[PDB]
Amino acid sequence: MSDQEAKPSTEDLGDKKEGEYIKLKVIGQDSSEIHFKVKMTTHLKKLKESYCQRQGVPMNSLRLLFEGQRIADNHTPKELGMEEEDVIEVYQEQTGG
């Protein structure tokens, strides 16, 4: 009733232990914690796209930011200052409705 979530699109569900990548975590306002695997030299769009894919919500509904800076696509974790945790904060801001 009154839901705005679609079907969760799992991009990856295997090779959790067998791989050379770290596991990041995203904090959602709806008390949601998603864990996904990624490398430190990967694009930042993959981080945001994976998080929204698992939830099944519109991209223009939640804003992802880190330490006050904006996260784009051609950005790198080493540039934004992402450490071992790689955890990003999300804020609910629907464009109109």
Side-chain angles (χ1 to χ4, degrees):
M1 244 300 181
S2 182
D3 297 272
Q4 236 185 300
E5 299 108 289
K7 206 80 217 192
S9 356
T10 55
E11 280 261 301
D12 211 348
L13 51 120
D15 258 351
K16 297 139 279 220
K17 284 186 269 168
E18 320 103 296
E20 228 62 57
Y21 33 50
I22 53 129
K23 320 193 200 316
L24 88 120
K25 185 205 272 200
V26 191
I27 297 305
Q29 310 242 258
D30 285 90
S31 182
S32 178
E33 288 171 90
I34 315 182
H35 246 270
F36 239 85
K37 68 256 277 278
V38 87
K39 279 191 204 184
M40 268 293 294
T41 180
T42 336
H43 266 158
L44 253 301
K45 46 108 86 216
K46 246 275 148 148
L47 255 75
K48 276 156 92 136
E49 265 188 86
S50 301
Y51 150 73
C52 308
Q53 247 21 86
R54 263 251 61 156
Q55 311 248 92
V57 277
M59 257 273 191
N60 55 301
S61 162
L62 4 105
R63 310 193 120 160
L64 285 98
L65 80 318
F66 188 66
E67 90 125 29
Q69 83 200 295
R70 225 166 283 154
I71 284 102
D73 320 90
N74 205 31
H75 266 151
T76 32
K78 75 190 172 143
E79 224 191 48
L80 307 177
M82 302 275 204
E83 66 263 90
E84 265 175 90
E85 282 103 322
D86 207 24
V87 52
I88 359 173
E89 203 162 282
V90 200
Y91 284 133
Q92 235 199 60
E93 253 216 270
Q94 301 218 45
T95 62

